[PDB]
Amino acid sequence: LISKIPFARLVKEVTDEFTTKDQDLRWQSMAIMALQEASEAYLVGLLEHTNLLALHAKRITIMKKDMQLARRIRGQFLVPRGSMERHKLADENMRKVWSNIISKYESIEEQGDLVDLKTGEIVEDNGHIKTLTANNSTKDKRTKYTSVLRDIIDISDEEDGDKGGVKRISGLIYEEVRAVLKSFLESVIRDSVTYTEHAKRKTVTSLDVVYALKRQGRTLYGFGG
């Protein structure tokens, strides 16, 4: 209403798809930073492989080099199945990476709207039923098309570049990327309503993003030390 912002909508809207009570709740940019957390990690990974060369690849004959490198990574469209737990680590490092920056912002000073985030004395909601919706963010399909729209154009990623003729080159990696975004939110939000509620708060506590990501990486590490 105040201003357009597809990004915030991705997290805000998806989170709003849950309990109707959040039909008009504008939490602090903390939840927004969470969105960027998922993007920040993927951005580095994507940038690490794509490289400015992939962007201007067409212009640069290098269209066949760092490009094939990006193809040798995540090029395989396989779903988690314990194929290599030792490797799932590196992927977890990326998730933890975004968890670190969130640890720093974990002290954000509500510079915008004000809801029961940490103070627990403000509520910007219409009202509904008090329960753990946990509608699973995997339901993120309302307006997620905006994510790919700006996610790619922003990086102008050419990907494998030398498609060779596949064409279907694109859509595979971006699809899996969205997959992790769903599970990321799913675990985070479900934990948000659970932990945020136990915190006599019905909003988005940075503790959820930090604590949620913490337990996720812990289980993935296959340890509990």
Method in brief? NMR
Q: How far is CA 21 from CA 26, 105, 125, 130, in A?
A: 12, 26, 6, 8
Separation between Cα atoms, residue 105 and residue 108, nearest integer Å: 5
Rounded to whole angstroms, how far apart are CA atoms 93 and 19? 32
Q: Considering only CA atoms, which of 122, 137, 130 is closest in space to residue 198?
A: 130
For residue 152, what are the domain limits?
A: 1-225
Structural domains of the chain, count? 1
Angle at 177 between CA 174 and CA 180, to 5 degrees: 155
Q: 7-12: long-range contacts at Cβ-Cβ below 8 A with a sequence spacing of 24 or more?
A: 7/32, 7/35, 7/36, 7/150, 8/32, 8/35, 9/143, 9/146, 10/35, 10/140, 10/143, 10/144, 10/146, 10/147, 11/35, 11/185
Rounded alpha-carbon distances, angstroms, from residue 127 to 106, 116, 124, 130, 181: 27, 14, 9, 9, 28
CATH number of the domain enclosing 32 = 1.10.20.10
Q: Distances from the Cα of 63 to the Cαs of 53, 55, 67, 188, in angstroms?
A: 8, 9, 6, 38
Token digits of residue 170: 């694109």
DSSP string, 81-126: SSS-HHHHHHHHHHHHHHHHHHHHHTT----S---SSSS-------
